[PDB]
Design a protein around this ligand. Structure first.
Ligand SMILES: CO[C@]1(C(=O)N[C@@H](C)c2ccc(-n3cc(F)cn3)nc2)CC[C@H](c2nc(C)cc(Nc3cc(C)[nH]n3)n2)CC1
Ligand SMILES: CO[C@]1(C(=O)N[C@@H](C)c2ccc(-n3cc(F)cn3)nc2)CC[C@H](c2nc(C)cc(Nc3cc(C)[nH]n3)n2)CC1
Lengths: 285, 273
């Protein structure tokens, strides 16, 4: 595609920001990038030499999705180097890294959580959730289930701006408002809705479940969900009716919103436009 | 679904009591799971403590990971061969799912070779793997993920085939650089695609844990293999051995050798030394 193909000579790759088993994200710089003069700091998502067909299909799918979606709280695609070399995916540089990493740092790093850029209040945590909810509102409007919504997969940009990232597992759902796969999914079990885990059904309403898990991560400052519980235990735990308890540092109003997101029946959960309104009513109060 | 049924089913011959397992140091770990050394008291009617390896999931494990671990348990109950990694059992009643397997002291074959052995030792390793694969092929088991990282090196340098989480009897998460051409283009996995992968494993042995297709990205390999290209003859490799690699990488699966032929070729190399 000529609108997205970037000259490889103009990209210069730097240090590794982080790494999986099959791929990595490196800090980079790009010369003469989409009208800009000079160099621009960017992130490059790419595969390792041990890459599977599924990892390659997912990186290709992330590229496809990112060409079609533009939102202030969705990570911005600049382009790709995809001829005479490996597939390099050029995306916006979010300076604070993951939301999980950012929030876990605020425990350790002063001024820290307080109930400018390192001082956090409950007001700021609600704001972060609201930004992500606004991005998911838009992504649900585009007929697009993210599936892997979690605090490790949100990035934190300049001005503490939330950027939904890691679109490799996201699927189109124009067909039937649902994505169903026969085989087992690669979403971590502790972020999955009950119908996704048991029945393999992924909708906007299972992204609402996952968002509920993200809310819990946000208020506990990057907590590990279902702490100490093996992931195989989630099948029986969720079926019988159990959900994560109210974390210390969380209002009744916020916990009701979490419990709403984790209703067994997906029609009884709130849509992303309602979630945005709840968080607005929390903010103003 | 399939996994909720398996998990529930999974929760006597293979149930090891948790109180007799003492987990030791971590041997290594991926994103979603780890392998730890342990001591097992009264393991399968054996006196005292037996050193074992324990595979457990990490707490961000997916359904895919959990299925693979249960699938490995399912496969390893049906197989017993000196060059396949032995299952002793599982802890399923007391906390997380622990899979208890044979302990091989030197780690992965890839890691063993990268530390480094004569050409006779290298040919002996390829033969052992080929023997275990001849056994697996006879048991109707396609391994799928044959590679030097998925072979373990036990005491006396005995090769153990391992990592049975992706094996199937009779989308894709096997790395592109080890997959057969019909696997790449048609998603077909047979004994003859294990042969292809063994050929890549054979290349890894003679290079002392080399990275296959070095400086070619996996995305470009599809069209290089389709057109006819293969890896050239590596250094410290005979004409006889390279010919055996090239035949494992024939496009048509019928033209590739079976594992009896491979073993027979390797038996004929060692007797001529
Ligand atoms: C959560 O993401 C990180 C990580 O460790 N990811 C692992 C788990 C990971 C797994 C698979 C693959 N794959 C990449 C592929 F192409 C395929 N898989 N890459 C990485 C940790 C945070 C890191 C980062 N740190 C800082 C300080 C800034 C920053 N800015 C960014 C990052 C981006 C994309 N834009 N701007 N990113 C990015 C990588
Ligand atoms: C290739 O295997 C190692 C590794 O780092 N693997 C990573 C990449 C990895 C990924 C996923 C999971 N998962 C485990 C799960 F349950 C799910 N995923 N575990 C580990 C490196 C070698 C290490 C080892 N070192 C030594 C010195 C000895 C040794 N002996 C053994 C090992 C066994 C099984 N029996 N005896 N093993 C075992 C782990």
């Amino acid at each position: 595609d000529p609108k997205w193909e970037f000259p490889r000579k103009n990209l210069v790759l730097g240090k590794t920001l982080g790494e999986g088993e099959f791929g990595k994200v490196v800090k980079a710089t790009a010369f003469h990038l989409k009208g800009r003069a000079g160099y621009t700091t960017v992130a490059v998502k790419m595969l390792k030499e041990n890459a599977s067909p599924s990892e390659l299909r997912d990186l290709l799918s992330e590229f496809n999705v990112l060409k079609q979606v533009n939102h202030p709280h969705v990570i911005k695609l600049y382009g790709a180097c995809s001829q005479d070399g490996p597939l390099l995916l050029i995306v916006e540089y979010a300076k604070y890294g993951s939301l999980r990493g950012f929030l876990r740092e605020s425990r350790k790093v002063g001024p820290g959580y307080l109930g400018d850029e390192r001082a956090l209040t409950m007001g700021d945590l609600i704001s972060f959730a609201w930004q992500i909810s606004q991005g998911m509102q838009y992504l649900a409007e585009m007929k697009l289930v993210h599936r892997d919504l979690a605090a490790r997969n949100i990035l934190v940009a300049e001005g503490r701006k939330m950027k939904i990232s890691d679109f490799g597992l996201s699927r189109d759902v124009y067909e039937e408002d649902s994505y169903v796969k026969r085989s087992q999914g690669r979403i971590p079990v502790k972020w999955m809705a009950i119908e996704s885990l048991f029945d393999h059904i992924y909708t906007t309403q299972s992204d609402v479940w996952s968002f509920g898990v993200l809310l819990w991560e946000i208020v506990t400052l990057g907590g590990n969900p279902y702490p100490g519980i093996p992931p195989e235990r989630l099948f029986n735990l969720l079926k019988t009716g159990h959900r994560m308890e109210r974390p210390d540092n969380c209002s009744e109003e916020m916990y009701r919103l979490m419990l709403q997101c984790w209703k067994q029946e997906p029609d009884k959960r709130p849509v992303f436009a309602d979630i945005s309104k709840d968080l607005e009513k929390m903010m103003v109060k």
